[PDB]
Amino acid sequence: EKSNIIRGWIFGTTLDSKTQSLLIVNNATNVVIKVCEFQFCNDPFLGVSEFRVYSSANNCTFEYVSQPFLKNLREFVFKNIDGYFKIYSKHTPINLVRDLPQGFSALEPLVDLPIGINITRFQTLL
Amino acid sequence: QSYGFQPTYGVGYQPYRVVVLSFELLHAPATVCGPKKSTNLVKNKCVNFN
Numbered sequence: 001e002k003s004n005i006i007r008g009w010i011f012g013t014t015l016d017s018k019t020q021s022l023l024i025v026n027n028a029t030n031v032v033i034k035v036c037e038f039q040f041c042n043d044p045f046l047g048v049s050e051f052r053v054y055s056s057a058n059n060c061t062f063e064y065v066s067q068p069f070l071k072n073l074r075e076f077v078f079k080n081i082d083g084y085f086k087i088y089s090k091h092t093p094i095n096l097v098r099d100l101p102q103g104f105s106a107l108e109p110l111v112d113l114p115i116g117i118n119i120t121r122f123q124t125l126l
Numbered sequence: 127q128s129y130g131f132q133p134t135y136g137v138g139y140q141p142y143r144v145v146v147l148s149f150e151l152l153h154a155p156a157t158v159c160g161p162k163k164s165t166n167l168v169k170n171k172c173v174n175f176n
């Protein structure tokens with residue numbers, strides 16, 4: 001985390017107006033999970049104003065809102081099982097500063113979304 | 127061509143709004159359902175729970 005500058009994802013099979021594409025974004029209020037299809041750009045920087053991740057949403061099925069995802073490790077597991085998308089999570093402080101430390105902490109599930117779109121690739125937004 | 131609706135037409139020539147509902151029973155992660163029963167609670171008695 002350090003200075004954050006994170007939060008956002010873009011899943012899906014392709015990235016050009018074909019099939020659908022989750023956008024699990026965070027803005028300190030709502031982790032809105034929109035399965036609406038957009039057209040994307042190279043380096044969309046937003047917040048602080050300028051919102052240009054997207055161009056248009058055409059036809060979509062799902063929507064959602066919840067609470068946000070809260071020298072520390074932010075750690076997730078993204079899994080897809082027969083039309084159910086699951087996102088486990090954990091956020092733990094550490095004292096070591098080099099790499100992933102030696103220890104043990106299980107991940108406690110957060111959500112479960114019935115979508116039904118098969119996914120192949122993803123990339124992270126800032 | 128335009129319908130012309132007036133208060134005095136009889137029964138067969140009055141507006142009769144229609145709403146058609148179509149359901150899909152295909153194989154997918156179905157999400158829409160109906161309401162559920164919430165019968166009361168008992169304790170210390172041999173019962174069948176669901």
Ligand SMILES: *[C@@H]1O[C@H](CO)[C@@H](O[C@@H]2O[C@H](CO)[C@@H](O)[C@H](O)[C@H]2NC(C)=O)[C@H](O)[C@H]1NC(C)=O
Nearest residue numbers: 025026027028029030031032033034063064065
């Ligand atoms: C964080 O982003 C979400 C997603 O845009 C915002 O949620 C919207 O909130 C407004 C305010 O009532 C609603 O009218 C919209 O329907 C919501 N959804 C969308 C997609 O716009 C949320 O307001 C943002 N948080 C802050 C603090 O601005």
Ligand SMILES: *[C@@H]1O[C@H](CO)[C@@H](O)[C@H](O)[C@H]1NC(C)=O
Nearest residue numbers: 017019037057058059060061
């Ligand atoms: C969305 O998908 C449907 C599925 O066939 C398609 O007919 C429609 O043109 C698409 N776009 C919109 C805006 O509905």
Ligand SMILES: *[C@@H]1O[C@H](CO)[C@@H](O)[C@H](O)[C@H]1NC(C)=O
Nearest residue numbers: 012013014019117118119120
């Ligand atoms: C997703 O599934 C459909 C139908 O099963 C298939 O046509 C499509 O190629 C799949 N997407 C992949 C494999 O990325």
